Design a protein around this ligand. Structure first.
Ligand code: MGD
Ligand code: MGD
Ligand code: SF4
Ligand code: 6MO
Length: 715
């Protein structure tokens, strides 16, 4: 009986786990003394691992490669040779006839590891010759990286997860650490315990708010209004950091102008917050010796989101909360390895190490190394534009790996036609998802406990994860599949193991070089940059200690005028749908939903958080099936009246296959990072009298999808 160390595949907290293996099976999971979690885990880390064993509760695991030779249907099993030559043939064919950019590839922020995201970008650029490589950063914190890239020169958490415990104030903004990153929540609570203050800015009364000294329930979509007003106060009352501002910032004056206007009072109605709170909050934040900003999707998933990120970073600039421990700007990245995939270059504009393709010197390096003459220099397509490129015949095949767009992408009807407008669609997954079911050719890969590599925690902290078991089927690691297709396409590629990839990588990314496998070890947490292999170089805890990484070393101050989200609350739909996530269930719910204990706390269709006071005047009560209509759709869900959602808005998540909230969301791709406005959707809740008939609708509709997906996997 033994224990195999791993990192949790759910959130980016980067919790270290000891998976007890007995015989040839995973038996139990238990917290390990990792750097972030230190012996603790949450329900998911603890219970969410039996999906490796093909429970088939939700979807049967992918066992054989498959091909759908006729669009009319029928996804029949096929051998590796047949699948692998089919892809290699098809891609090569399409590449010749229409150029390398006619192909779009995606990396994966889940169980694969950093090694394979690296391999994926490598194949797109060296084999296909395209920069068309992107990942969910696109739909998550893509805005965060941009805004931050410009403001301060780097898009990662400025400071570490383990630094929170010593801030003097934890400014939580549009982010629920309590349900999203429980171990990050536990670091927040620690700070409070140690006497730090806490401010939560969210319309809803989220768990976090209870321990908050100040809860600032800003009206959905009024972020910049509230922000400029805080900046207004900080300057008005001379609470800002003059020396810091003068010595390390650029653009103060121009920022000063736009906030002068936004007085606390002029904001009252838009923010729905009183001039006083705004004053006391800005006053509070600016007064902390060290104050840290933790933010998330309440910021990014709004088209005016790069501006909000830029705006927040401004406050921190203005207060000198950068360049020092227990402070900074912290966009807590979401998925276990989304941070990683980015580090690997699963972005359509950067090689791993954040060495952009535009730079000629980088291309010379990478091309030489990959033994290629030219690596493309123009930015690739972003996966969020797929439906648009696809429709235009700009893209003709997609190599979708480790993702479930047909359930997670905004405006799912759009992605379906997208899948219908592409010549070839290849899905590389571990489960028969809605996305895999609508594929031309499916290729299965080894799941988390069946392979190894490295993952990057929310705060750029490298960590190693180990193989615990063997796949019960003839599966390849994601990098072995891509390597074989590359080879079949004429470019030789084969890796004996993941470290081999990690070393090639380390030799091309001067900031990851010192993060050797030996160094990361079993419980090591090595946040890049880590340049020297020297064990004295344990990694970088916080950024911008000496300079700001901007072209000229100064942070760049910034704001703009508030602008309301797209749709408009009418008299019929004064209801604001703000999609979020739930605990116990993670994203796709492909892994989580196939886990016995987690499945047992929540199944279809999902819940819609409806406000107490106003629900009583809507004709909807707790546990009742209700309808949600929209320009994009009309979804069915179970209500849950309570005093938590803010009167006027409702809340739904994207983890449900039946009441797929994304069915209703219109993609209001931000003009900058091309990110959907998943946080604001004008909807109309409608009661349902014949509940009993609705209760069988959810069942029948669920059963249909479950058998559907099942026949495709097991036929
Ligand atoms: N249990 C569980 N955990 C997860 C996930 C999951 O699926 N399940 N997903 C993971 C991933 S991929 C990510 S990116 C993270 C995301 O985790 P979070 O960043 O917490 O994201 P959300 O919960 O979507 O939204 C955060 C908050 O923004 C608030 N908000 C809405 N409108 C506004 C507004 O106008 N202003 C402000 N200030 N706030 C607003 C919402 O009410 C919500 O409480 O969670 C990760 N962790
Ligand atoms: N309404 C609404 N929609 C949203 C959001 C929202 O807030 N509201 N949030 C958005 C955000 S921030 C995100 S992160 C997305 C999540 O976006 P998704 O792309 O849905 O992410 P997952 O659901 O984790 O998908 C992971 C896929 O990879 C598979 N997989 C796991 N391990 C491996 C592996 O080793 N190899 C391979 N090949 N496959 C593997 C899983 O089975 C699953 O099919 O949702 C977005 N959509
Ligand atoms: S889901 Fe997150 S907080 Fe929970 S055990 Fe995993 S990494 Fe840690
Ligand atoms: Mo995310």
């Amino acid at each position: 009986m033994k224990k195999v160390v791993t990192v949790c595949p759910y959130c980016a907290s980067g919790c270290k786990i000891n998976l007890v293996v007995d015989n040839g099976k995973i038996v139990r999971a238990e917290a390990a003394q990792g750097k972030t979690n230190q012996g603790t885990l949450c329900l998911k880390g603890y219970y969410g691992w039996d999906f490796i064993n093909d429970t088939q509760i939700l979807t049967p695991r992918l066992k054989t490669p498959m091909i759908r030779r006729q669009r009319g249907g029928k996804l029949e099993p096929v051998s590796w040779d047949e699948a692998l030559n089919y892809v290699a043939e098809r891609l090569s064919a399409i590449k010749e006839k229409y150029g390398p950019d006619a192909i779009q590839t995606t990396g994966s922020s889940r169980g694969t590891g950093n090694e394979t995201n690296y391999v994926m970008q490598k194949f797109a650029r060296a084999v296909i010759g395209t920069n068309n490589v992107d990942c969910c950063a696109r739909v998550x914190h893509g805005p965060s990286v941009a805004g931050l890239h410009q403001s301060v020169g780097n898009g990662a958490m400025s400071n570490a997860i383990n630094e929170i415990d010593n801030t003097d104030l934890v400014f939580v903004f549009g982010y629920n650490p309590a349900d999203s990153h429980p171990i990050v929540a536990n670091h927040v609570i620690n700070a409070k315990r140690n006497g730090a203050k806490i401010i939560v800015c969210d319309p809803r009364k989220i768990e976090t708010a209870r321990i908050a000294d100040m809860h600032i329930a800003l009206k959905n979509g009024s972020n910049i209004a509230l922000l400029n007003a805080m900046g207004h106060v900080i300057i008005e009352e001379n609470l800002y950091d003059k020396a810091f501002v003068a010595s390390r910032t650029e653009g103060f004056e121009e920022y000063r102008k736009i906030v002068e206007g936004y007085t606390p009072e002029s904001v009252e109605d838009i923010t729905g917050v009183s001039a006083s709170e705004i004053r006391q909050a800005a006053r509070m934040y600016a007064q902390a010796k060290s104050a840290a900003i933790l933010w998330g999707m309440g910021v990014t998933q709004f088209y005016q989101g790069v501006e909000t990120v830029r705006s927040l970073t401004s406050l921190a600039m203005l207060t000198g909360n950068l360049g020092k421990p227990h402070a900074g700007v912290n966009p807590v990245r979401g998925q276990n390895n989304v941070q990683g995939a980015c580090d690997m270059g699963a972005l359509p504009d950067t090689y791993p190490g954040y060495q952009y393709v535009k730079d000629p010197a980088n291309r010379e390096k990478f091309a030489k190394a990959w033994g290629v003459e030219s690596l493309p220099a123009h930015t690739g397509y972003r996966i969020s534009e797929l439906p648009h490129r696809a429709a235009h015949g700009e893209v003709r095949a997609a190599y979708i790996m480790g993702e479930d767009p047909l359930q997670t992408d905004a405006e799912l009807s759009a992605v379906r036609k997208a899948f219908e407008d592409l010549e070839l669609v290849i899905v590389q997954d571990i489960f028969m998802t809605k996305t895999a079911s609508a594929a031309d050719v499916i290729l299965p890969s080894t799941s988390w406990g069946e392979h190894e590599g490295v993952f990057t925690a929310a705060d750029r902290g490298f960590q190693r994860f180990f193989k615990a078991v063997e796949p019960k089927w003839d599966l390849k690691t994601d990098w072995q599949i891509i390597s074989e297709i590359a080879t079949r396409m004429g470019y030789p590629m084969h890796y004996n193991n993941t470290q081999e990839i990690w070393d090639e990588l380390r030799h091309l990314c001067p900031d990851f070089y010192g993060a050797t496998y030996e160094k990361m070890g079993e419980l090591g947490f090595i946040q890049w940059p880590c340049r020297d292999t020297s064990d004295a170089d344990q990694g970088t805890s916080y950024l911008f200690k000496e300079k700001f990484d901007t072209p000229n070393g100064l942070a760049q101050f910034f704001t703009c005028d508030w602008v309301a989200p797209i749709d408009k609350l009418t008299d019929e739909y004064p209801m604001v749908l703000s999609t979020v996530r739930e605990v116990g269930h993670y994203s796709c719910r492909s892994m989580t939903g196939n886990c016995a204990a987690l499945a047992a706390l929540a199944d279809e269709p999902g819940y819609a958080q409806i406000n107490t006071e106003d629900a009583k005047r809507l004709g909807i009560e707790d546990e009742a099936l209700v309808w949600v209509h929209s320009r994009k759709g009309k979804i069915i869900t179970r209500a849950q009246v309570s005093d938590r959602p803010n009167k006027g808005a409702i809340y739904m998540t994207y983890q449900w296959w039946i009441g797929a909230c994304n069915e209703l969301v219109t993609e209001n791709l931000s003009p900058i990072t091309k990110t959907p406005e998943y946080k604001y959707c004008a909807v109309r809740v409608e009661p349902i009298a014949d509940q009993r008939a609705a209760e069988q609708y959810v069942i029948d509709e669920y059963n249909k999808l479950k058998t559907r997906l099942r026949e495709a996997a097991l036929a």
